[PDB]
């Protein structure tokens, strides 16, 4: 039997992204545009 | 092995570091102001 | 015996309890089942048995609150899957039950000034029938057979969960007006901020002139303890930094 | 008599009027189920499936009041599948509830 996991994602505002490859099975990453999450205390940051 | 039925998940003498596995992960788009990861997956082939 | 190094927290949720997507401090995740005897092992957001800084116990909980550290009583510890089923025996992030079939799996208790705390997921099982039959409770003859099962025991063998550093947490109850100018109102912890109408100032109570309360952010870190490397947090600068300790309960054939 | 309360519920005994706390209110279908804000003459609760519902407290000197008639439901099955609560991503869709207002 197998498990997954997905280690916490990342966020930087007013900066775009880049993700790295990196060896080990079955490896994806990808990469949203537009995103504006709002977390528990208020909203997260302002560049919207 | 394709998805879903018995010998998803191989290796050979059964100590580490050589898997094989493809079960079909895609990325899809998290919701409208929320934080999480969404996460998609055809269910396991050994407790099936 | 490690567990001076992180803290219980708070994260989203499935439902409430009243059917809406409260923020609580109890949320439940992986509620892996492996053992043949049927009990089940689930993971728990918030941490029991520890009472507040430093020193050993077995009555009084430990669940976070805003900022700050709160207690509770262990005596009135609930689970429902779809009737009672009782507890068995617990430490750490981890609780452990014996429960009856159904849909749902819920974990609540009672926190500080008299209210209630729930979360619903989903999952489903049955009995695994070992043997050639279908019992519930073992009766007084007849045949032993092999079974594998959890031990209570402290000392383990080697298997572990990552561990992370917090990330920073913005707030608006420290903002307010003067008439005019703005002031950030610190109540004794570092808060590093920015408007653009920003920098390191620790435990002073600064007052920066004109503008309006539209355009100043805020951010408090929690730079001393640690926290638990979950999906539902942001993660911390882009490096991979991160740590370790284990996990109880390991596995034993009776 | 004649003050609003969040706490003392009003019943009634031979010809007079009794008191008693609203913190031992309880209801069963065929296991627990909670209740989600009350008052008036009317409670509303979420309770899963069975064929009974039941209302009880505790009257002035430690005596129980009980009831119980009968009564069928299920879940409704509002998209298509069947659940028991929501979990955190998938679509959103129309339903109708209750308010909590006066």
Same mark, same amino acid.
């Given at each position: 039997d197998y498990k997954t996991k997905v280690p916490s994602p990342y966020v930087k505002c007013c900066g775009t992204a880049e993700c790295r490859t990196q060896d080990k099975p079955e490896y994806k990453c990808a990469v949203f545009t537009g995103v504006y999450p709002f977390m528990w205390g208020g909203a997260y940051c302002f560049c919207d | 092995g394709q998805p879903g039925r018995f010998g998803d998940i191989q290796s050979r003498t059964l100590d580490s570091k050589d898997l094989y596995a493809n079960t079909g992960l895609k990325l899809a788009r998290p919701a409208a102001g929320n934080i999480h990861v969404p996460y998609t997956q055809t269910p396991s082939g050994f407790k099936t | 015996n490690a567990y001076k190094l992180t803290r219980p927290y708070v994260a989203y949720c499935a439902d409430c309890g009243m059917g809406h997507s409260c923020h609580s401090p109890a949320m439940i995740e992986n509620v892996q089942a492996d053992a043949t005897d049927g009990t089940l092992k689930?993971?728990?957001? $918030?941490?029991?048995? +520890?009472?507040? %800084?430093? %020193?050993?116990?077995?009555?009084? &909980?430990?669940? !976070?609150?805003?900022?700050?550290?709160?207690?509770?009583?262990?005596?009135?510890? /609930?689970?429902? $899957?779809?009737?009672?089923? !009782? *507890?068995?025996?617990?430490?750490?992030?981890? &609780?452990? !039950? /014996?429960?009856?079939?159904?849909? =749902?799996?819920? *974990?609540?208790? =009672?926190?500080?000034?008299?209210?209630?705390?729930?979360?619903?997921?989903?999952?489903? #099982?049955?009995?695994? +029938?070992?043997?050639?039959?279908?019992? %519930?409770?073992?009766?007084? #003859?007849?045949?032993? +057979?092999?079974?594998?099962?959890?031990?209570? %025991?402290?000392?383990?063998? $080697?298997?572990?969960?990552?561990?992370?550093?917090?990330?920073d947490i913005p707030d608006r109850t420290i903002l307010s007006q003067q008439s005019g100018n703005v002031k950030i109102t610190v109540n004794g912890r570092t808060v590093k901020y920015s408007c653009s109408c920003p920098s390191g100032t620790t435990t002073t109570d600064k007052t920066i002139n004109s503008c309006t309360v539209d355009k100043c952010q805020a951010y408090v870190t929690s730079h001393t303890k640690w926290q638990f490397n979950s999906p539902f947090v942001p993660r911390a600068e882009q490096a991979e930094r991160k740590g370790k300790v284990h996990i109880p309960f390991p596995l034993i054939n009776t």
């Open positions: - | - | 689930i993971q728990f957001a $918030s941490q029991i048995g +520890l009472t507040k %800084t430093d %020193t050993h116990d077995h009555t009084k &909980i430990r669940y !976070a609150e805003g900022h700050d550290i709160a207690e509770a009583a262990r005596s009135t510890l /609930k689970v429902h $899957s779809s009737s009672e089923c !009782a *507890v068995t025996g617990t430490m750490g992030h981890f &609780i452990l !039950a /014996k429960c009856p079939p159904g849909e =749902v799996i819920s *974990v609540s208790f =009672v926190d500080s000034k008299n209210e209630q705390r729930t979360c619903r997921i989903a999952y489903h #099982h049955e009995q695994r +029938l070992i043997g050639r039959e279908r019992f %519930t409770v073992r009766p007084h #003859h007849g045949i032993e +057979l092999p079974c594998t099962t959890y031990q209570l %025991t402290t000392a383990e063998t $080697s298997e572990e969960i990552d561990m992370h550093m917090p990330p």
